[PDB]
Design a protein around this ligand. Structure first.
Ligand SMILES: Nc1nc2c(ncn2[C@@H]2O[C@H](COP(=O)(O)OP(=O)(O)NP(=O)(O)O)[C@@H](O)[C@H]2O)c(=O)[nH]1
Ligand SMILES: [Mg+2]
Ligand SMILES: [Mg+2]
Ligand SMILES: [Mg+2]
Ligand SMILES: [Mg+2]
Ligand SMILES: [Mg+2]
Ligand SMILES: [Mg+2]
Ligand SMILES: [Mg+2]
Ligand SMILES: [Mg+2]
Ligand SMILES: [Mg+2]
Ligand SMILES: [Mg+2]
Ligand SMILES: [Mg+2]
Ligand SMILES: [Mg+2]
Ligand SMILES: [Mg+2]
Ligand SMILES: [Mg+2]
Ligand SMILES: [Mg+2]
Ligand SMILES: [Mg+2]
Ligand SMILES: [Mg+2]
Ligand SMILES: [Mg+2]
Ligand SMILES: [Mg+2]
Lengths: 154, 325, 216
RNA sequence: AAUUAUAUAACUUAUCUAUUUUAUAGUAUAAGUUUGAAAUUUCGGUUGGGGUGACCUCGGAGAAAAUCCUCCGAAUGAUUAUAACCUAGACUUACAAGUCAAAGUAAAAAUAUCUUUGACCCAGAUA
RNA sequence: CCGCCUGUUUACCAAAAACAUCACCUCUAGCAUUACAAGUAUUAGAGGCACUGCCUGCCCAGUGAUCACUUGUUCCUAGGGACUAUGAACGGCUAAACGAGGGUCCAACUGU
RNA sequence: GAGCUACCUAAAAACAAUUUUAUGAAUCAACUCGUCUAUGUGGCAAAAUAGUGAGAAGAUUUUUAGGUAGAGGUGAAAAGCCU
């Protein structure tokens, strides 16, 4: 069954050259330090990762590992890598600046309970703003444009 | 080892969260987000020219719309478009000054009347001085700054914008002396006086790491700020003539630095010097500029500018004080 | 509060924070880290309270050595992390009893609670007070743990029976008219030590010492 | 930490083979790229014990030619009538660096006006 | 009080609460002629950690029910297709037994 | 340089008596170790003596020959041991 889902979402898995597959897998092993079982889980759960180029998957994983304070198990069980970087940064940064999210410190502790990763990304924008952040849709659109300008300067 | 910016945010969350309650997040994100600039024309050489080009850029003068002689162009609500950098005009004067729009509100509320004398107790580079000296028609305006390096900036701005003839005459007078001492020097001299006391500079404090008031070494000065602010406000209150008007301006959101300082100055002046200061209502001010500004009205004395992502023109606190005698 | 079963240990933090709110903080006003101190007479569970809070909020476990004897924690130690979200810190201090114990009865009542090392008050004397209080309160639960039939009011008699139940004997020098002779005897001292232990465990009944003198 | 890193491990291009209609595969080597087993070298100064903050060069001002003595600034710009070359004699000065300047000649037909700092080597840009 | 236990250690100032230890857990590896091993996932290697039983419960789209719509993810252009298909982290203690371990008490005993 | 010591390989050896649920069980020799005290401190000894103690059929102890070598070896990690 795992092959069936992979083939449907990513028909080019067989066609792709050896180098492309090895680089994606090697990034998950050497650079992302995922266990053997997790590599199968990520490939099966989000087949599009193979399409995603290297050095961009690594950035997304490090974004969760360091900036969001997530663990390997959380990343795999929530299909974090499935989502696009733009959606991750827009929603996470909005929550962080609002003060409703906070990085786990060295001790591993957070002063405020962090919203569940399923609430941050999986849910719709309307529910995400209304429930997790309790903001207005207009502000989020303005923030997106403001964030976009900063990336260009970055 | 938290940085100076980290401490500033850490302190603000502890206090401003209580003061502003549910509104602190919206303010918190807005402060961390990029600021919104409002273009102010130089009148003078390009009194018409700059206005036409800015209108093509879709920026609209909020002051002119509010009236519906200071005209400041700002973009529409929620529009993130920036302003092109100011350029030198044919006559040798700069096209416009790009500054925080809310910084110009205290000047607009000072109610300058023609043939008046004005003092800026601490206008280091502030465009407040430029706005006052621009179309104010105030005879013998005076500027004083504690520092000399920032005093240099003020002359730079005046030179670029103010024509020599206006500045050449003693009608503009720049000084570098203690503001509190200034009260004794010139008592009951000036009709209108603007006092912008040193403030915690919340937005700049978070963004800028260097010369941040929240640094550990400068803790002594940071704690002493409320005392110093009261002294400067009292000195200006002494300087203003009988029946004069003064406005106390502060950038921070702290209740200690906004409401207590003004009332403390009134109480100190009422007792030691036996002078009564009666505040002037500014509620109508909120109604006029609500389009281009959002204000937290609960404040007993003064008007506070709250930064929101829709209108990121904060943070500013300004209270108008009229000397009854 | 009960610290072995972690009962009512959630309510402490909300109340503790509420008190700090109403009060002032002055020098530490800007610090987001809350530190508080636990003090009391020895063997009251000060060190237990620290661990019990640590696991109810921080969920890490035991951080202060806990013992069944008075005077285990010797000095004011460094800070120990106890909570995370409020972030309160607890300081642990050695138990301090008193310079003077007011009434001697006040000192007996504390000896029964384990606050006083029974060896500088006398096991036998403490045992008599325990029997005296246990009989008045009607909690005749020591006549079933130890078979005592009708019960009694003489400490020597009850101590005799319990020593028999536990099959304990000593060689004790008794002083008689013709000289000194070592005679095998039932162990009254060991009986008193064990009799107090069962009281401390709680199997002899629920007792409120202050019920009689200070009912208020 | 700085400098390296054919230890391994990957890759890419050559080279060499086979095949192949240009493709594949491989590879006694060379050149790269990624990892780092290792290798080499270092621990400025002023700071009761520390922790911490700081400070290290020069200019302005008081004490008055001392100080862990007390203050303000600078690593400037603005302003322009654009401010040459050559040459007595002096200042200051460990050295190095830094100042003032008659005469003569030459441009023009009043100087620039406000009031500072980085050597050598070595790299740049040009006619 | 500490360590499960028998063991081990600083030859020559530390024998211990340290190390090891059964048990439990994590990670790596699908394979042969010199170790692992003449072995093959119930195996082997690397490492962590008292076990035992008892608790807590991160978590695993929603809404109408094997089922319909909104989501989610991708594309084609805000429209249109394509596709979803028990248990983490932890704890309080088997609870005994054992010890030239570290504290304490009673009895006896005594030139301390 | 592994005739000491650390670990390993090969070939060998020793363990009385007394109890026991039959064993990294118990008591206690030989044997191995080295707890505590006194003596000794150029000593009998460059780590001993005298008592007192721990284990003593086992992860025990011991003998012979071989092996691993300093950018290293060995280590039930004391950064311990390798004349
Ligand atoms: N039954 C019961 N026993 C408790 C409770 N709390 C503590 N104990 C018992 O008390 C002892 C622990 O006390 P402890 O925490 O050391 O107290 P302390 O005051 O901090 N010790 P010290 O005398 O050294 O200052 C243990 O015997 C423990 O079982 C409780 O709530 N109930
Ligand atoms: Mg010289
Ligand atoms: Mg001349
Ligand atoms: Mg042991
Ligand atoms: Mg042992
Ligand atoms: Mg030994
Ligand atoms: Mg030794
Ligand atoms: Mg021992
Ligand atoms: Mg020893
Ligand atoms: Mg251990
Ligand atoms: Mg021992
Ligand atoms: Mg005795
Ligand atoms: Mg040998
Ligand atoms: Mg035998
Ligand atoms: Mg045995
Ligand atoms: Mg023995
Ligand atoms: Mg034994
Ligand atoms: Mg060994
Ligand atoms: Mg060690
Ligand atoms: Mg060590």
């Amino acid at each position: 069954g795992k092959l069936k889902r992979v083939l449907s979402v990513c028909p080019e898995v067989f066609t792709m050259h050896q180098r492309d597959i090895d680089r994606v897998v090697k990034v998950l092993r050497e650079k992302c330090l995922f266990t053997a079982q997790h590599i199968t889980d990520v490939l099966h759960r989000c087949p599009t990762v193979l399409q995603e180029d290297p050095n961009e998957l690594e950035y997304k994983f490090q974004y969760a590992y360091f900036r969001m304070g997530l663990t390997h198990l959380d990343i795999v069980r929530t299909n974090f890598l499935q989502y696009s970087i733009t959606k991750i940064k827009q929603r996470h940064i909005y929550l962080e600046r609002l003060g409703r999210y906070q990085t786990p410190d060295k001790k591993g502790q957070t002063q405020i309970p962090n919203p569940s990763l399923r609430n941050i990304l999986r849910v719709s924008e309307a529910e995400f703003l209304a429930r997790t952040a309790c903001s207005s849709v207009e502000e989020f659109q303005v923030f997106k444009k403001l964030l976009d300008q900063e990336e260009e300067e970055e | 080892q938290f940085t100076a910016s980290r401490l500033a945010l850490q302190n603000f969350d502890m206090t401003y969260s209580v003061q502003f309650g549910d509104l602190w997040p919206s303010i918190r994100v807005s402060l961390l987000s990029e600021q919104k600039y409002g273009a102010l024309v130089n009148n003078f050489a390009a009194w018409d020219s700059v206005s036409a080009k800015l209108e093509q850029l879709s920026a609209k003068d909020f002051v002119s719309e509010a009236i519906s002689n200071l005209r400041c162009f700002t973009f529409s609500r929620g529009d993130v478009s920036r302003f092109p950098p100011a350029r030198l005009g044919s006559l040798g004067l700069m096209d416009y000054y790009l500054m925080d729009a809310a910084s110009l509100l205290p000047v607009l509320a000072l109610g300058l009347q023609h043939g008046d004398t004005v003092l800026d107790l601490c206008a280091a580079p502030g465009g407040k001085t430029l706005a006052l000296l621009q179309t104010g028609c105030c005879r013998n305006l005076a500027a004083n700054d504690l520092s000399t390096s920032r005093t240099g900036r003020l002359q730079k701005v005046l030179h670029s914008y103010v024509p020599q003839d206006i500045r050449e005459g003693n009608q503009v007078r720049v000084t570098s002396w203690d503001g509190r001492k200034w009260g004794e020097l010139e008592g009951d001299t000036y009709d209108r006086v603007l006092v912008d006391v040193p403030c915690t500079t919340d937005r700049h404090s978070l963004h800028e790491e260097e010369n941040n008031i929240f640094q550990r070494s400068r803790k002594k000065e940071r704690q002493m700020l409320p005392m110093l602010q009261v002294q400067l406000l009292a000195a200006g209150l002494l300087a203003t003539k009988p029946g004069g008007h003064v406005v106390y301006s502060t950038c921070s959101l702290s209740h200690l630095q906004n409401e207590y300082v003004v009332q403390g100055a009134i109480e100190l002046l009422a007792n030691q010097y036996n002078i009564k200061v009666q505040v002037e209502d500014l509620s109508h001010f909120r109604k006029l500029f609500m389009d281009t500004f959002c204000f937290f009205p609960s404040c007993q004395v003064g008007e506070l500018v709250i930064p929101n992502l829709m209108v990121n023109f904060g943070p500013m606190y300004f209270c108008k004080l009229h000397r009854l005698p | 509060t009960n610290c072995v079963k972690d009962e009512n240990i959630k309510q402490i933090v909300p109340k503790v924070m509420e008190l700090i709110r109403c009060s002032y903080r002055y020098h530490r006003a800007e610090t987001p880290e809350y530190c508080i101190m636990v003090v009391g007479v020895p063997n009251v569970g000060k060190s237990s309270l620290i661990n019990s809070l640590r696991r109810q909020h921080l969920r890490t476990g035991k951080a202060a050595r806990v013992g069944g004897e008075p005077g285990i924690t010797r000095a004011v130690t460094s800070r120990i992390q106890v909570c995370e979200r409020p972030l309160v810190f607890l300081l642990d201090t050695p138990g301090v009893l008193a310079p003077r114990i007011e009434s001697v009865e006040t000192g007996l009542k504390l000896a029964l609670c384990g606050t006083v090392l029974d060896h500088l008050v006398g096991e036998e004397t403490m045992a008599d007070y325990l029997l005296y209080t246990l009989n008045r309160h009607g909690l005749f639960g020591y006549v079933q743990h130890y078979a005592l039939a009708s019960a009694c009011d003489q400490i020597e008699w009850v101590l005799k029976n319990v020593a028999i139940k536990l099959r304990k004997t000593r060689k004790v020098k008794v002083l008689t008219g013709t000289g000194n002779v070592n005679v095998i005897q039932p162990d009254y001292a060991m009986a008193a030590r064990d009799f107090l232990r069962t009281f401390r465990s709680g199997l002899l009944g629920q007792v409120m010492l202050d019920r009689d003198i200070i009912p208020a």
